[PDB]
């Protein structure tokens, strides 16, 4: 019911996430301010460990570079456990997406800008998140912020190959373009109400479909003509043909307000 980090005590309001020996708690400090504490039980290969160490260091470093990256106020690391005190936000994008029926065009555009800026920041520092999904983004102050960089083991709020890029499947035996496809699927869902290959319930079929150039993705007409173009450009199977993050930041959909 209580946790301590660097001589500071927090009260466990509730658990909001879980994973491989890892938990996320909604907490309050002495002055009743709210924060998110990530607990990691280190009793974990030399490698799983180094993966958490790497994530912590990049998250910390990347703090200064963008307000679209989640805030890490402090952390406690020992041979037994890891405690991470960070911004708590309102709710993760994945949970919020399920509760809302329709999404506002302005909100969708603002959110897309946030995601783009966050992924852009991590790319400039040589990080390619490799598993991008809505659960990786947190809604804080009517704005989206990136929670993790996909370096450490992934957690889930309290998996699917829907957002999986084709190059990652073909290369079965790394480019920043992979994050573009994933972002495209998130925006596609934000626009059409589902991921491009959501219907395929058969997984090996879904996989074959994601990679097959003959399997055409549906882009039914909409009033925002730019959005439709963004989606088309983001969902190019060939990574070389696929639009880049710097190009997406200069796209009319993001640049020109309607
Ligand atoms: C699994 C969620 O993980 C996190 N959720 C956070 N916020 C959060 C997550 C989920 C909810 C929710 N859906 O209740 C509300 C807030 C903040 C974090 N800093 C982290 C981390 N790490």
Please state, in angstroms and rounded to a whole number, the distance separating the CA atoms of residues 234 and 190.
Answer: 14
5: part of which helix (H) or strand (E)?
strand 2-5
| Nearest atom within ligand 1 for CA of residue 38 | 22
If one counts the domains in the chain, the total is: 2
Phi, psi at residue 214, to the nearest 5°?
-80, -20
Give rounded-to-5 percent helix, strand, coil for the chain: 40, 20, 40
CATH number at residue 74: 3.30.200.20
Q: Note down the domain range covering 16.
A: 3-90
Is residue 157 located within the same domain as residue 247? Answer: yes
Q: Which of 152, 66, 154 is nearest to 115 (CA)?
A: 66
Best mutation site among 138, 143, 158 for ligand 1 pocket (most ligand atoms within 8 Å of CB): 138
Exposure string for 158-191, b = 16+ CB within 10 A, e = fewer: eeeebbbbbbbeeeeeebbbbbbbbbbbbbbbbb
Tokens of 178: 């992979």
Q: What residues are annotated to the active site?
A: 131
Structure tokens that stand for 247 in this block: 């190009």
Compute the distance between CA of residue 15 and CA of residue 78 in angstroms, rounded to an integer: 22
Burial (CB < 10 A; 0-12, 13-18, 19+), residue 98, is exposed
Q: Confirm or reject: Cβ of 154 under 6 Å from ligand 1.
A: no
Domain end residue (candidates: 67, 90, 113) = 90
CATH (domain of 207): 1.10.510.10
Give yes or no: residues 111 and 235 share one domain.
yes
Q: Which of 88, 90, 75 is nearest to 12 (CA)?
A: 88
C-alpha 252 – ligand 1 centre gap (Å)? 32
Strand partners, 74: 85
- Which residue, of 55, 90, 125, is where some domain finishes? 90
């Amino acid at each position: 019911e209580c946790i301590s980090v660097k001589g500071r005590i927090y009260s466990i309001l509730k658990q909001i996430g879980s994973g491989g020996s890892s938990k996320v708690f909604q907490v309050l400090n002495e002055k009743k301010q709210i924060y998110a504490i990530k607990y990691v039980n280190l009793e974990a290969d030399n490698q799983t460990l180094d993966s958490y160490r790497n994530e912590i260091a990049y998250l910390n470093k990347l703090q200064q570079h963008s307000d679209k990256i989640i805030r890490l106020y402090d952390y406690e690391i020992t041979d037994q456990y890891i405690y991470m005190v960070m911004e708590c936000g309102n709710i993760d994008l994945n949970s919020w997406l399920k509760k809302k029926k329709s999404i506002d065009p302005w909100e969708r555009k603002s959110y897309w800008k946030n995601m783009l800026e966050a992924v852009h920041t991590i790319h400039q520092h040589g990080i390619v998140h490799s598993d991008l999904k809505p659960a990786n983004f947190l809604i804080v102050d009517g704005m989206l912020k990136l929670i993790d960089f996909g370096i450490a083991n992934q957690m889930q709020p309290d998996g699917t190959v829907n957002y999986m890029p084709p190059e990652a499947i073909k290369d079965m035996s790394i480019s920043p373009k992979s994050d573009v496809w994933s972002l495209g699927c998130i925006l596609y869902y934000m626009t059409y109400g589902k991921t491009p290959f959501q219907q395929i319930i058969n997984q090996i079929s879904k996989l074959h479909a994601i990679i097959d150039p003959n399997h055409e993705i549906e882009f039914p007409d909409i009033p925002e003509k730019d959005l439709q173009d963004v989606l088309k450009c983001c969902l190019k199977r060939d990574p070389k043909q696929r639009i880049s993050i710097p190009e997406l930041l200069a796209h009319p959909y993001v640049q020109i307000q309607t």
